[PDB]
Amino acid sequence: MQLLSGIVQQQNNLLRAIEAQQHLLQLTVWGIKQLQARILAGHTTWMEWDREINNYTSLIHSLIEESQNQQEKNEQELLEGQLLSGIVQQQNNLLRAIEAQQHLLQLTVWGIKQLQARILTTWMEWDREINNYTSLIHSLIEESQNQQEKNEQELLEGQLLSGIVQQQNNLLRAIEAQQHLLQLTVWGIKQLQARIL
Amino acid sequence: IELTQPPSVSVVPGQTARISCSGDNIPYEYASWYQQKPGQAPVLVIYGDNNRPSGIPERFSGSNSGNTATLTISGTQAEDEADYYCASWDSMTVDGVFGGGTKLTVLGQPKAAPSVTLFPPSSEELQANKATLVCLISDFYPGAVTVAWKADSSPVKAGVETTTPSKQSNNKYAASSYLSLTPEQWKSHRSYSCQVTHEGSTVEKTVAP
Amino acid sequence: QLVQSGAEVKKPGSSVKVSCKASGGTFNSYAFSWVRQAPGQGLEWMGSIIPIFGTTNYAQKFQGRVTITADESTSTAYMELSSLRSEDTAVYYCARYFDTYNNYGFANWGQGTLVTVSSASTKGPSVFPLAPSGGTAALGCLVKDYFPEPVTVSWNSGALTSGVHTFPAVLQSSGLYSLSSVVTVPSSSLGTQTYICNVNHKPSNTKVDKKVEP
Ligand code: NA
Ligand code: NA
């Protein structure tokens, strides 16, 4: 049945995007650490930053691995109820990963902002863009959580089908907003590196 | 971070090898393991918590407990003979760090005592007003040896240069030792000996002007 | 993936810049370290670059002596090490990590670049015969006082191949190398067969033949 296989295929693609975004995020973290070791903003605060980074990085990896497991199960089910259930759970997995990545992304904005305080005016214009996309992704996440709740409720007790399709749209929108934020943090870091020494 | 590895570990073909690396701090996921053979670049064998790259045999696995990581090779093959290095990163500073490396020997090769050939200075070299004795040492195993020189059964220490041992095609080892002398020194002693000690047993050669 | 520039021979106090051309991925997804290895020794991490930002960090031992750079349009990373000393003699590797988002290990390595730091000047060897003196006899050639490595030795213009053993060179306190090559031959050949060692040292353009006589 092509509708559901089409959703499973798109879920694989969203997960792939999440992994590529995790990779970029990780590079931004490393880049921020290199800059901080040179610039040295303010230290216990940076130790807690580092701890938080490590916590969320661990979380994200676990979510990605669980998503990879669920993806494999759904693709098995396609060959084989359980499919709809697995598709909903995969939407939950992807949403948790996006939420955790968004927190990680906000930790890098914190780091970038601490550094740009010492290298000092298009920071304010960079700020406005960060805020705009932060608000957008927050509202997309909020809407995605509500939809997930409705789908899960219906799954237990179609509005289910419609809710699943709309949730695909919600997730992709949020991943797309995250991409824009990543381009913004990449820009901020290059701009900082260009100004040192 | 300072990563401590055992200098060497040995195993029988089919037996399991275990190479420890102690010193890393959390997160341990930053860590990795490398295999390096002579004259080759290192090869990544494990990264993070027991992740194997494509093309790395299943007999290789990584584990960890506290600040101690362990590379395990189940049913080790002779081709597993190599140096193995652990590495990690410091979390706050992103400083890389390697352990000191562990040479893994897979046992099988019998003990072989060195063959030694000792050559006196050539007439031609003596005419150029120089003198060197050439002590050539080959076909030994294991691959470690000490060299002592004597002139008339008294120890000579000056003018001695000796190579480190190196692998032959045999998988046996070779080294050489050179004793430099003036022609006057050379011609004013009755005999000279090159003495090679390998696993507590000494092989001697002597030459006379 | 990673192809480095060729071997270098330098004098104390000079500089060296080693290159590493990366092919077959996305440049902006790269993360590189430089890692060195003295002969017979372990790996030593020198520093890193993240090319998408151009951000770097170096091991403290090398602060003020080393610069890591990368160029996107030529897809090449560089390591420049200044105020060279004899203890900097090593194979230098570029290495890429972050092959995937959770792979912090070095997945790809360059072939390595040997950098030899020495005050010695290029010099061709002197060659001397190691004369022989039942079963078998050993005869050879002593190849003395050359710089840098390597020297090639053949016997009887390549016709003599069995029983040849050319030993790894010794590095003398003078900064010069010497080595020996020996052939084990039958005693009964010592009268009949002529033995000549053919020595090549390319850096000084030395080609020398030496007849080895009983
Ligand atoms: Na420790
Ligand atoms: Na680094």
Author numbering:
A (entry chain A): 1 to 42, 47 to 84, 89 to 128, 136 to 172, 177 to 216
B (entry chain L): 2 to 210
C (entry chain H): 3 to 52, 52A, 53 to 134, 140 to 220
Which sentences from the paper describe this structure?
The KD values for the binding of Fab 8066, D5 (Fab and IgG) and Fab 8062 to 5-Helix are <<10 nM, 10–20 nM and ∼200 nM, respectively. The HIV-1 neutralization potency of Fab 8066 (in monovalent format) is 1.5 to 4-fold higher than that of both the D5 IgG and Fab in an Env-pseudotyped neutralization assay using Envs from four laboratory-adapted strains of HIV-1 (HXB2, SF162 JR CSF, and 89.6). Indeed, the segment of the CDR-H2 in Fab 8066 comprising residues 51–58 literally takes the place of the position of the N-terminus of the third C-HR helix in the gp41 trimer. In particular, the side chains of Phe-54, Ile-53 and Thr-56 of CDR-H2 preserve the interactions with Ile-208 and Val-205 of the Nc helix, substituting for the intrasubunit interactions between the Nc and Cc helices of the 6-HB. The amino acid sequence of the CDR-H2 loop converged during selection to be almost identical in Fab 8066 and the D5 antibody, with the exception of a single residue (Thr-57 in Fab 8066 is an Ala in D5), and therefore the interactions of CDR-H2 with 5-Helix are very similar in both complexes. Two such polar interactions are unique to the Fab 8066 complex, and involve a short hydrogen bond between the side chains of Thr-57 of CDR-H2 and Arg-38 of the Na helix, as well as a hydrogen bond between the side chains of Asn-58 and Gln-34. The conformation of CDR-L2 is similar in all three complexes, except that in the Fab 8066 complex the tip of the CDR-L2 loop is oriented more towards 5-Helix then in the other two complexes. This allows formation of two solvent-mediated interactions with His-65 and Glu-69 of helix Ca. Indeed, the gap volume index (which reflects the tightness of the interfacial packing) is significantly smaller in the Fab 8066 complex (2.3 Å) than in the Fab 8062 complex (2.6 Å). Our modeling suggests that three molecules of the most potent neutralizing Fab in our series, Fab 8066, can readily bind to the N-HR trimer without any steric clashes between adjacent Fab molecules.
During the fusion process, the conserved N-heptad repeat (N-HR) of gp41 in the form of a trimeric coiled-coil is accessible and presents an attractive target for the generation of broadly neutralizing antibodies. The 5-Helix construct comprises a single chain in which the N-HR trimeric coiled-coil is surrounded by only two C-HR helices, thereby exposing one face (comprising two N-HR helices) of the internal trimeric N-HR coiled-coil. Here we report the crystal structures of two affinity matured Fabs from this series (8066 and 8062), each complexed to 5-Helix. These Fabs represent the extremes of this series, since Fab 8066 was the most potent of the affinity matured Fabs, whereas Fab 8062 did not exhibit any detectable neutralization activity.
